[PDB]
Amino acid sequence: MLNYNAPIDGQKSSIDGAGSDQMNTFYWLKKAIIQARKDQYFMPLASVTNM
Amino acid sequence: MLNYNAPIDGQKSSIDGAGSDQMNTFYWLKKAIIQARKDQYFMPLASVTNM
Amino acid sequence: PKNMGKTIKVYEYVPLLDDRNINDQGIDANGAHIVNGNLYGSSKDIGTITSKLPLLTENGGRVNRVGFTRLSREGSIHKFGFFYEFTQESLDFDSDDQLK
């Protein structure tokens, strides 16, 4: 019946055979989950005297 | 030195730690290698008689 | 291209009449599922083609079903390279002046 058994889970898609398998099996979101700087509450309260 | 190792053969890349791996590990050329029709004699030497 | 691993893979598309078309979906003229389904495949026996011809009747439905297969050709890339050292006094104070 030429199904599309889940290729990620291991079941090869019905069209594929021998050693072919599916190749694009997931859409990569090209936007990373990045963190931000943890805030500072003591560094601002500091005058700088040169040396 | 964080090295690429070999993700295709199983060795995870150094920066890809815990449950992660490279998510573009090859290239689809997207140009299928197909075969043409077999040479056909017999068939073109034929007259037709409509029914 | 860069940033895509080290492997080029393509897709092969086997024709219907081909021994490489080892598919499951196949049902013969008698309406019975068979272990094959690339019709007569690549064999050229008169008896075999006669017995596997997609012959159909007046009131004929699910009678002859074919199947298709797909193949992939992997291709990798490797690295090579050698080198050689050479001392300074092995280039200035030497017989030949064009050793480098």
Side-chain angles (χ1 to χ4, degrees), chain A residues 2-8 10-29 32-47 49-51, chain B residues 2-8 10-29 32-37 40-51, chain C residues 1 3-11 13-18 20-58 60-73 75-92 94-100:
Chain A
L2 253 184
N3 326 61
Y4 174 51
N5 326 298
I8 289 269
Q11 338 309 352
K12 175 162 32 73
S13 312
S14 187
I15 171 69
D16 302 289
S20 99
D21 204 335
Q22 283 265 117
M23 312 216 298
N24 298 338
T25 69
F26 54 110
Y27 177 67
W28 172 31
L29 260 181
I33 309 175
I34 69 94
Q35 303 264 0
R37 286 138 92 101
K38 279 132 88 67
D39 42 15
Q40 328 169 52
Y41 287 122
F42 294 90
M43 203 84 185
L45 328 184
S47 175
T49 73
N50 330 290
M51 156 87 75
Chain B
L2 48 90
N3 40 5
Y4 178 50
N5 284 295
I8 276 304
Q11 283 94 320
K12 264 162 41 193
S13 319
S14 288
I15 193 163
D16 287 52
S20 322
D21 198 290
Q22 309 264 13
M23 323 198 321
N24 262 349
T25 49
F26 48 72
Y27 184 15
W28 198 30
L29 217 52
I33 54 184
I34 51 180
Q35 314 215 340
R37 302 202 182 155
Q40 211 180 220
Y41 308 83
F42 295 124
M43 221 45 209
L45 71 83
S47 38
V48 317
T49 299
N50 255 302
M51 170 98 69
Chain C
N3 291 287
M4 289 262 200
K6 306 152 51 148
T7 292
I8 303 287
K9 332 213 303 298
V10 304
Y11 259 102
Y13 269 87
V14 185
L16 174 49
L17 285 309
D18 207 302
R20 281 138 58 229
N21 198 341
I22 325 186
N23 96 77
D24 197 357
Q25 36 172 80
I27 169 160
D28 59 30
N30 294 289
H33 302 116
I34 68 186
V35 86
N36 42 304
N38 52 67
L39 293 179
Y40 65 86
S42 322
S43 61
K44 292 181 275 185
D45 153 28
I46 277 304
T48 289
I49 276 191
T50 307
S51 80
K52 286 141 178 304
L53 262 195
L55 256 165
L56 195 138
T57 178
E58 304 156 328
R62 321 195 30 95
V63 166
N64 289 104
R65 189 167 53 149
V66 303
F68 312 74
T69 47
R70 221 165 42 184
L71 282 180
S72 291
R73 294 301 161 51
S76 307
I77 209 174
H78 291 126
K79 186 184 260 302
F80 304 121
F82 40 94
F83 84 108
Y84 82 93
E85 288 147 295
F86 62 115
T87 321
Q88 170 74 306
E89 60 204 328
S90 182
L91 259 188
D92 299 5
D94 198 286
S95 197
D96 192 39
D97 89 10
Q98 29 185 7
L99 194 41
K100 185 55 189 202

